[PDB]
Amino acid sequence: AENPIFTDVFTADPAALVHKGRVYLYAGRDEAPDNTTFFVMNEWLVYSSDDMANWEAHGPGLRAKDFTWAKGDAWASQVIERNGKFYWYVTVRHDDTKPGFAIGVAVGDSPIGPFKDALGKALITNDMTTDTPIDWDDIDPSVFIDDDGQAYLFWGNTRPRYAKLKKNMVELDGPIRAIEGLPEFTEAIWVHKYQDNYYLSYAMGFPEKIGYAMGKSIKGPWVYKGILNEVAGNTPTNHQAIIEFNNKHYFIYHTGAGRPDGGQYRRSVSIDELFYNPDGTIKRIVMTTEGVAPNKS
Ligand SMILES: [Ca+2]
């Protein structure tokens, strides 16, 4: 499965999920004419695989403009299943009623949708977080359900943060907490659990690499552990998903390696295998051209 995996579109900010034997893969879609101005993103695209290698294209799943309160900009996202429903947390640009980037939540009854705004309003709004003056801090959501039934929302650019999510998945429960322990944090938090440990991987520095920290609890304390991913080919933004599928571990990300004239604002999803050490640490990723081998049940 030669990387990059999709060649008919540029494709970025991957998020993935396993359901009923299939991997569902979610990505934003880079529509920019060149690598020299800025992101131009309007819609998220959905893909699914049997085996990690052959991908079925289900087309657009959600456009940013599907949020009445949103101006545009369909930035990084993450989907989760809970109670026969699917929650899609998005980064969009709020309209001038609450200036600045915001986090919204959509809902569907199946992995491919149809998806609709679950709230009719932002879940996180720029003015809720004012310990930084920048107006793109509230981006890149990540979502997690711990073994005790408690769900959590993580996000941030420049300022990493989390909060408890109510069962209904569309409401914060309790206060927003600043996360300590993530040297050089930039963005792209991805939380997951493996065996007895918790893992918070993130984009780090600039141009971005991915670093990660481990915790004995979802509330940490987090212990930075080293570099998970080198800086990716022809792109300053590095953006991960980590999933477990069929006894192998998958590290999904993007590169500027596509054609034609791929790069900074014309990115492409690539996939490579992740391996754990016996102590629980993750081997540094090796980003490869040939990508991943099939692996179906
Ligand atoms: Ca803010």
UniProtKB/TrEMBL annotation:
Pfam families: Glyco_hydro_43 (PF04616). Its EC number is 3.2.1.-. GO terms for molecular function: hydrolase activity, hydrolyzing O-glycosyl compounds; metal ion binding. InterPro entries: Glyco_hydro_43, Glyco_hydro_beta-prop_sf, Glycosyl_Hydrlase_43_Enz. Keywords: Calcium, Carbohydrate metabolism, Glycosidase, Hydrolase, Metal-binding, Polysaccharide degradation, Signal, Xylan degradation. It comes from the Bacteria. One of its GO terms (biological process) is xylan catabolic process. The record marks D140 as: Important for catalytic activity, responsible for pKa modulation of the active site Glu and correct orientation of both the proton donor and substrate. Ca(2+) binds at N126, T129, D137, D138. Belongs to the glycosyl hydrolase 43 family. This is Beta-xylosidase/alpha-L-arabinfuranosidase, putative, gly43N. It comes from Cellvibrio japonicus (strain Ueda107). The lineage of its organism: Bacteria, Pseudomonadati, Pseudomonadota, Gammaproteobacteria, Cellvibrionales. The gene is gly43N.
